[PDB]
Amino acid sequence: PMFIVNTNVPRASVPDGFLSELTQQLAQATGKPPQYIAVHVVPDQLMAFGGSSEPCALCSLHSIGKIGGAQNRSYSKLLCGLLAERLRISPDRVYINYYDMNAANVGWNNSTFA
Amino acid sequence: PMFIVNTNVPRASVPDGFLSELTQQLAQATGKPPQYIAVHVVPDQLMAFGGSSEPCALCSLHSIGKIGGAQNRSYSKLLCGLLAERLRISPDRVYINYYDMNAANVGWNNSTFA
Amino acid sequence: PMFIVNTNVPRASVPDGFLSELTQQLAQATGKPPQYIAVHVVPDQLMAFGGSSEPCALCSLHSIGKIGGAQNRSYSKLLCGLLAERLRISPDRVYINYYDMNAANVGWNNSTFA
């Protein structure tokens, strides 16, 4: 797994430690090893949510398995929680798209996972 | 629904009001309430279309339903007409990837939509 | 096709010619006409792979067909090799997500391809 957050929150409001905290929490939540987790934060974006430019986020979580109805609900709680606490973004201004990737459709180290 | 555009056009060519205009036009086109529509514009990108770096765009529209053959063609006409009129990007240098998201694979407000 | 690379490598490390080379090499690999191929490179990103901020990349390749077990392995070797050679990113710090798009879900030139 890989997690991307795009946000209008400015770069200086992103705590040092944030990427490393995302990595560790995602390891716990997904059961995958932290050494294979990727995280990407994109601040200072030009975006609106409901026509307003108060803090908001558009995110994604890609995983080879560990995606489904109950799991995505816990991920959303965890992730919205982190975004609320660390970036001061309200949970109702965050979308997270979940993608269950086939191992054949993930490239890594000159090959794929299948 | 959420709409993202990445483009090589500079930020200063993005008119003021463009995010509001996208929000209102997508609200009408999708039928979804405006307060839930998210829009994201990413100018000044390093990109090329057909090997040429004249103005271009790579876009996404995600929605829980309201995605399909005829509807997608209609969204493309709407959206390419906005990009052409507002950012001066020729419609034949724009791609829009459409994603019909399962409600269970969209996180929002600490949970999902299923 | 369309290929997007996101990376923490700095902008000044992306060689002139890189987008053309990607274009040409993707034409060769996918067999599609160069004029349809879109490429997009986003340097200087805040990102981590395995908790480390050594050079890394998160990529996508979208195509209408020409995605599959063996083809994806071949694309990963090609694109990781370019990333290693031109941006100095180790292949084991690159993820590439592959998307086989339905023609109906690709907008272009006021319409879609289905």
Author numbering:
A (entry chain A), B (entry chain B), C (entry chain C): 2 to 115
Give me lines lifted from the publication on this model.
Macrophage migration inhibitory factor (MIF) is expressed at high levels in various inflammatory diseases and cancer. Macrophage migration inhibitory factor promotes directional cell migration (or chemotaxis) of various cell types 2, 3, 4. Unlike canonical cytokines and chemokines, a trimeric MIF molecule has three tautomerase active sites at the trimer interfaces 23. Although the enzymatic activity is vestigial, there is accumulating evidence that the active site is important for receptor binding 24, 25.
12 is covalently bound to Pro1 in the middle of its structure and as a result occupies more of the pocket compared to 1 and 2. Because of this higher occupancy of the active site, 12 may stabilize better the conformation of the active site than 1 and 2, resulting in no disruption of MIF interactions with its receptor. The phenol ring of Tyr36 was moved from the original position (magenta) as shown in 1‐bound structure to a slightly open position (green) in 2‐bound structure, and to the fully open position (light pink) in 12‐bound structure. MIF:12 shows high B‐factors only for L1 and this also suggests that L1 may not be critical for receptor binding. 12 increased the flexibility of L1, whereas other inhibitors did not. Thus, it is likely that 12 disrupts L1 interaction with either CXCR2 or CXCR4 and is also responsible for the partial inhibition of p110γ expression.
